Amino acid sequence: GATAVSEWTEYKTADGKTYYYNNRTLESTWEKPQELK
């Protein structure tokens, strides 16, 4: 009964969008991760 929070950095591209690059197994996330808590 525990949740996980991965490496959620800020890798915002030239779109002005905050893109997250997850160091899970090395993952990318466009918006706020499902595990962003």
């Binding site: 890798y11 915002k12 591209t13 893109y19 690059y21 990318s28 996330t29 466009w30």
Partner: peptide
């Protein structure tokens, strides 16, 4: 120098 971003999927 600063790192380049990967493009997101």
């Amino acid at each position: 120098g600063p790192p380049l971003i990967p493009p997101p999927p």
